[PDB]
Design an enzyme around this catalytic site. Structure first.
Site, PDB file in Angstrom:
ATOM      1  N   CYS A   1      -5.564  -1.570   5.647  1.00 52.06           N
ATOM      2  CA  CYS A   1      -5.911  -1.726   7.045  1.00 52.06           C
ATOM      3  C   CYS A   1      -7.060  -0.786   7.360  1.00 52.06           C
ATOM      4  O   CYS A   1      -6.998   0.059   8.243  1.00 52.06           O
ATOM      5  CB  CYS A   1      -4.707  -1.522   7.966  1.00 52.06           C
TER       6      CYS A   1
ATOM      7  N   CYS B   1       2.742  -0.245   4.530  1.00 55.39           N
ATOM      8  CA  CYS B   1       1.597   0.599   4.203  1.00 55.39           C
ATOM      9  C   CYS B   1       2.049   2.037   4.364  1.00 55.39           C
ATOM     10  O   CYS B   1       2.241   2.517   5.501  1.00 55.39           O
ATOM     11  CB  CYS B   1       0.435   0.236   5.073  1.00 55.39           C
TER      12      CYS B   1
ATOM     13  N   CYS C   1      -0.557   4.573   5.688  1.00 57.02           N
ATOM     14  CA  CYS C   1      -0.496   4.405   7.139  1.00 57.02           C
ATOM     15  C   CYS C   1       0.696   5.104   7.739  1.00 57.02           C
ATOM     16  O   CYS C   1       0.581   5.836   8.724  1.00 57.02           O
ATOM     17  CB  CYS C   1      -0.441   2.892   7.456  1.00 57.02           C
TER      18      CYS C   1
ATOM     19  N   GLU D   1       0.852  -1.163   0.000  1.00 51.03           N
ATOM     20  CA  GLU D   1       0.000   0.000   0.000  1.00 51.03           C
ATOM     21  C   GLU D   1       0.903   1.232   0.000  1.00 51.03           C
ATOM     22  O   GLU D   1       1.834   1.339   0.796  1.00 51.03           O
ATOM     23  CB  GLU D   1      -0.891  -0.011   1.250  1.00 51.03           C
TER      24      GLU D   1
ATOM     25  N   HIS E   1      -7.751   2.353  12.114  1.00 56.78           N
ATOM     26  CA  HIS E   1      -7.574   3.708  12.593  1.00 56.78           C
ATOM     27  C   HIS E   1      -8.876   4.298  13.198  1.00 56.78           C
ATOM     28  O   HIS E   1      -8.821   5.107  14.137  1.00 56.78           O
ATOM     29  CB  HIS E   1      -7.076   4.598  11.480  1.00 56.78           C
TER      30      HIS E   1
ATOM     31  N   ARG F   1      -0.439  -4.894  10.913  1.00 56.10           N
ATOM     32  CA  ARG F   1       0.972  -4.621  10.778  1.00 56.10           C
ATOM     33  C   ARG F   1       1.707  -4.268  12.054  1.00 56.10           C
ATOM     34  O   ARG F   1       2.920  -4.126  12.000  1.00 56.10           O
ATOM     35  CB  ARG F   1       1.209  -3.553   9.699  1.00 56.10           C
TER      36      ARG F   1
ATOM     37  N   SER G   1       3.629   0.880  10.302  1.00 53.71           N
ATOM     38  CA  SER G   1       4.615   1.045   9.223  1.00 53.71           C
ATOM     39  C   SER G   1       5.531   2.225   9.486  1.00 53.71           C
ATOM     40  O   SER G   1       6.602   2.282   8.916  1.00 53.71           O
ATOM     41  CB  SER G   1       3.946   1.173   7.861  1.00 53.71           C
TER      42      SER G   1
ATOM     43  N   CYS H   1      -5.799   4.812   5.748  1.00 52.11           N
ATOM     44  CA  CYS H   1      -5.526   3.651   4.937  1.00 52.11           C
ATOM     45  C   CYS H   1      -6.783   2.806   4.775  1.00 52.11           C
ATOM     46  O   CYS H   1      -7.512   2.569   5.758  1.00 52.11           O
ATOM     47  CB  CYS H   1      -4.435   2.823   5.615  1.00 52.11           C
TER      48      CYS H   1
HETATM   49  N1  FCO Z   1      -2.107  -2.789   9.930  1.00 50.71           N
HETATM   50  C1  FCO Z   1      -2.030  -1.719   9.498  1.00 50.71           C
HETATM   51 FE1  FCO Z   1      -1.921   0.067   8.805  1.00 50.71          FE
HETATM   52  C2  FCO Z   1      -0.051   0.138   8.919  1.00 50.71           C
HETATM   53  N2  FCO Z   1       1.089   0.200   8.972  1.00 50.71           N
HETATM   54  C3  FCO Z   1      -2.175   0.589  10.420  1.00 50.71           C
HETATM   55  O1  FCO Z   1      -2.351   0.938  11.486  1.00 50.71           O
HETATM   56 NI    NI Z   2      -2.592   0.482   5.986  1.00 55.99          NI
END
Ligand code: FCO
Ligand code: NI
Ligand SMILES: *S(=O)(=O)N1CCOCC1
Ligand code: SF4
Ligand code: SF4
Ligand code: F3S
Ligand SMILES: [Mg+2]
Ligand SMILES: [S]
Lengths: 263, 545
Positions: free
Chosen positions: B71, B539, B542, B21, B75, B472, B495, B68
């Site tokens: 995922c 990501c 992210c 991503e 969030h 992640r 990430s 994102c």
């Molecule tokens: N899993 C996921 Fe996205 C990332 N890095 C988030 O929080």
């Molecule tokens: Ni993500």
């Protein structure tokens, strides 16, 4: 035998990849059938095998294809500092999108971000993000929502390839999918008409499935087909007890907020 | 049996990194065919923390969810936990259960798509599948996985025929310029294994639709769920019998695929690439935990997560330290932010963008550099797995030991790119093993109690933190409320931890360290770089937000 499926180039600009994710939730057809039988998906960063210079070479090969191509754009265009806050292969996203747009057979903006600018354009817009038409002055077929239903995106793609350009509203959205208000098809409409509202999320009225208008629902001002087609063949926000955010409307991050109020 | 390695000495830049991503540029320096230095350069900034200033704290989760869409949900969940903490509301038991089940559904969707659709093409030569004997492939599949009709010779042949028609069409599409085209020494699998994996790649495209439908029964829709509110959840229907019956049925189908296809394919691939148990290691691991039985405060989340929280340093599995939320900070020295921003705890976070130029090794990423007690930390499935295994968490002990026995490797082999990949599957299997228990808990609770949202009031001034272990890794959202509005909102995302740049002392991030020592068989087709980068499941939307 000489064979050709229509070429699609998909660009990712200032995006969250939720529109790519929505697209792969298609079941009519499933995504494999679409890309094996209907289109030639010739550049798509999230799923393509090539990386780096090999990916850039695949893009250039698609853009220079003698059969032409359709352009899908996911994400807004970050324009501040000469486009440098959003880059792929060392090139500003606005530059690559401008080049791809100039020779495309047609341009489909998947999501509120590419259509209108989206989340990164919300005030104070740090990156000076713009929608594709906003930035480039080109007309686009807009498939907004955050993300749009796959039914609307894949339906539009298939329409473009088999029928032509679908009738669009003044916001560039196909009337086939975006011609009706969310509210006009909402199963809570009889509660709305009877002024039967949930005053809070913990209320007995909420438990009974009363209308969510007092909790901010933007269904009355939002064009989308959510209650009619559902998401994932099972649900949509109001059925899960939550108001509509207005997410298929231009600039909704600023025009529909505060989300839990009627501003 | 030696791992293929050229004599190449020089730079390699890979931009775009595909099958992640977001927008990542990796630069490495290579000498005699091994990477000797690395940079993780994130290439897009959006600025959600800036956008949130002055807004209604109730709105945060809607904005931050759009960090994102891979995922998705996580969030919204972290922001909801964060604002719940800032307003000092304890969500009802049913809301804890529902939120945690939606996280479980997310893990299943996300990890399945990652392994097949993002990572497999680094290990599987799809074109070589056209060379396989489908009967031999069916016999092999029968030896390594449960009997299933999709592994029959007839089924595998139908896959081969579809792929043959596609390749001979002249439009290779997503396989254009694939690193495996024409043969590549770093690709080890027999054709029959390529065919089994490719068949499952296609099945997984259909199975992920079902995983997302399960998630949407509780979440409202996928992507971008819409069932969380301050104080709990809105989805009363999700507590009820028929929806939960459908959720169980779909989840059982997805778990059957995990157990029949994902784990056996993962172990087959791992068996051929055992050399990758010695490539791509790091030393320090962090988790906030997930799947807690008490989410009434961040401290209770840390203490009661069924996938436990903790900190491991220096590969020492004999000691797991408690997470000290006060010890987290972010640097910007090597990032595209204004000078003066180093060392900031997220309650004091600053997001002041300042771009320089491409490949400026003094400022080379839009990610900040999160550090913990001065150290970089790897987060994600491998971190969770090591922490849980070290603590004797019984599901992790069982499933980890199953893998160690199948591969004839010690637990130390998991400090690697192969290990990181394996851990992602281990935990997917564990989530599956717990779904029936978690669903029954929620079904029985929802049958007796329909409290789903607690009452609360917005404070004039407060602060709060929301913790989650997303697919992640360790995710935290941190709010300062003033005048009943957002004064500061900081995201520190997995990430960011894994793929951020160097910190204030010039210390490499986990991905940068992991890339040191990577062999490069062909510098024009550096699949080995992708294997390690993809193993962290990056990501960038992210990571930067
Ligand atoms: N899993 C996921 Fe996205 C990332 N890095 C988030 O929080
Ligand atoms: Ni993500
Ligand atoms: S609201 O403004 O009361 N509303 C109700 C009907 O249609 C749009 C907006
Ligand atoms: S429209 Fe929404 S879901 Fe699609 S890229 Fe933009 S933020 Fe993500
Ligand atoms: S819940 Fe929203 S869309 Fe449904 S009737 Fe009420 S205001 Fe309209
Ligand atoms: S938030 Fe968006 S997905 Fe439909 S229900 Fe409202 S237009
Ligand atoms: Mg941040
Ligand atoms: S084409």
């Amino acid at each position: 035998t000489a064979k050709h499926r229509p070429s699609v180039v998909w660009l990712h600009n200032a995006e969250c990849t939720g529109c790519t994710e929505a697209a792969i939730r298609t079941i009519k057809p499933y995504i494999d059938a679409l890309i094996l039988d209907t289109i030639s998906l010739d550049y798509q960063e999230t799923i393509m095998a090539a990386a780096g210079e090999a990916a850039e070479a695949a893009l250039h090969q698609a853009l220079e294809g003698k059969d032409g191509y359709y352009l899908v754009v996911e994400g807004g265009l970050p324009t501040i500092d000469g486009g440098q806050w959003g880059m792929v292969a060392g090139h500003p996203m606005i530059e690559t999108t401008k080049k791809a747009a100039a020779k495309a057979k047609g341009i489909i903006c998947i999501g509120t971000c590419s259509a209108y600018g989206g989340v990164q354009k919300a005030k104070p817009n740090p990156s000076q993000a713009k929608g594709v038409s906003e930035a480039l002055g080109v007309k686009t077929i807009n498939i907004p929502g955050c993300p749009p239903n796959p039914i609307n995106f894949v339906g539009a793609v298939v329409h473009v390839l088999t029928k032509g350009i679908p009738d669009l509203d003044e916001n560039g959205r196909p009337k086939l999918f975006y011609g009706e208000l969310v509210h006009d098809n909402c199963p809570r409409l009889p509660h709305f008409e009877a002024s039967e509202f949930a005053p809070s999320f913990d209320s007995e009225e909420a438990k009974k499935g009363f209308c969510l208008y007092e909790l901010g629902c933007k269904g009355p001002v939002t064009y989308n087909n959510c209650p009619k087609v559902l998401f994932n063949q099972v649900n949509w926000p109001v059925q899960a007890g939550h108001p509509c955010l207005g997410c298929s409307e231009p600039d909704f991050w600023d025009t529909m907020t505060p989300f839990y109020e009627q501003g | 049996k030696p791992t293929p390695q050229s004599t190449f000495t020089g730079p390699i830049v890979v931009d775009p990194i595909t099958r992640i991503e977001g927008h990542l540029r990796i630069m490495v320096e290579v000498e005699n065919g091994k990477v000797k230095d690395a940079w993780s350069s994130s290439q897009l900034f959006r600025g959600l923390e800036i956008i949130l200033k002055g807004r209604d704290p109730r709105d945060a989760q809607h904005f931050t969810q759009r960090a994102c869409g891979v995922c998705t949900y996580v969030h919204a969940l972290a922001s909801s936990r964060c604002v719940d903490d800032a307003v000092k509301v304890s969500i009802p038991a049913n809301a804890r259960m529902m939120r945690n089940l939606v996280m479980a559904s997310q893990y299943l969707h996300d990890h399945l798509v990652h392994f097949y659709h993002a990572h497999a093409l680094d290990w599987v030569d799809v074109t070589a599948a056209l060379k396989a004997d489908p009967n031999k492939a069916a016999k092999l599949a029968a030896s390594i996985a449960p009997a299933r009709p999709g592994n029959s010779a007839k089924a595998l042949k139908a896959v081969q025929d579809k792929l043959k028609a596609f390749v001979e069409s002249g439009q290779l599409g997503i396989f254009t310029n694939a690193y495996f085209l024409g043969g590549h020494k770093a690709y080890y699998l027999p054709p029959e294994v390529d065919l089994i994996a490719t068949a499952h790649y296609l099945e997984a495209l259909h199975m992920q639709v079902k995983a997302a439908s399960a998630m949407a029964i509780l979440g409202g829709k996928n992507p971008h769920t819409q069932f969380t509110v301050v104080g709990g959840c809105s989805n009363y229907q999700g507590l009820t019998k028929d929806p939960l019956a459908n959720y169980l049925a779909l989840s059982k189908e997805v778990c059957q695929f995990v157990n029949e296809c994902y784990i056996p394919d993962l172990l087959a691939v791992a068996g051929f690439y055992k050399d990758w148990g010695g490539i791509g290691g790091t030393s320090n691991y962090l988790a906030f935990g997930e799947f807690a039985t008490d989410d009434s405060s961040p401290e209770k989340h840390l203490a009661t997560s069924q996938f436990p929280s903790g900190v491991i340093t220096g590969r020492d599995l004999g000691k797991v330290d408690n997470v000290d939320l006060g010890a987290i900070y972010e640097d910007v020295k090597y990032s595209w932010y204004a000078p003066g921003g180093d060392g900031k705890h997220p309650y004091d976070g600053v997001t002041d963008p300042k771009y320089t130029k491409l490949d400026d090794k003094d400022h080379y990423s839009w990610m900040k550099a999160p550090r913990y007690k001065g150290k970089a930390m790897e987060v994600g499935p491998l971190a969770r797995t090591f922490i849980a295994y070290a603590k004797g968490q019984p599901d992790f002990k069982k499933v980890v030991d199953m893998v160690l026995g199948k591969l004839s490797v010690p637990a130390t082999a998991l400090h690697s790119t192969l290990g990181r990949t394996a851990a992602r599957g281990i935990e997917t299997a564990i989530v599956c093993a717990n779904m029936e228990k978690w669903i029954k808990e929620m079904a029985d609770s929802g049958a007796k109690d329909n409290t789903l949202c607690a009452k609360w009031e917005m404070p004039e001034e407060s602060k709060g933190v929301g913790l989650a272990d997303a697919p992640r890794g360790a995710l935290s959202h941190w709010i300062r409320i003033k005048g009943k509005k957002i004064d500061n909102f900081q995201l520190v995302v997995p990430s960011t931890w894994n793929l951020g740049p160097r910190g204030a002392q010039g210390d490499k991030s986990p991905v940068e360290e992991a890339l040191i020592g990577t062999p490069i068989a062909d510098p024009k087709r550096p699949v080995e770089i992708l294997r390690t980068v993809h193993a962290f499941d990056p990501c960038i939307a992210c990571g930067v937000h």
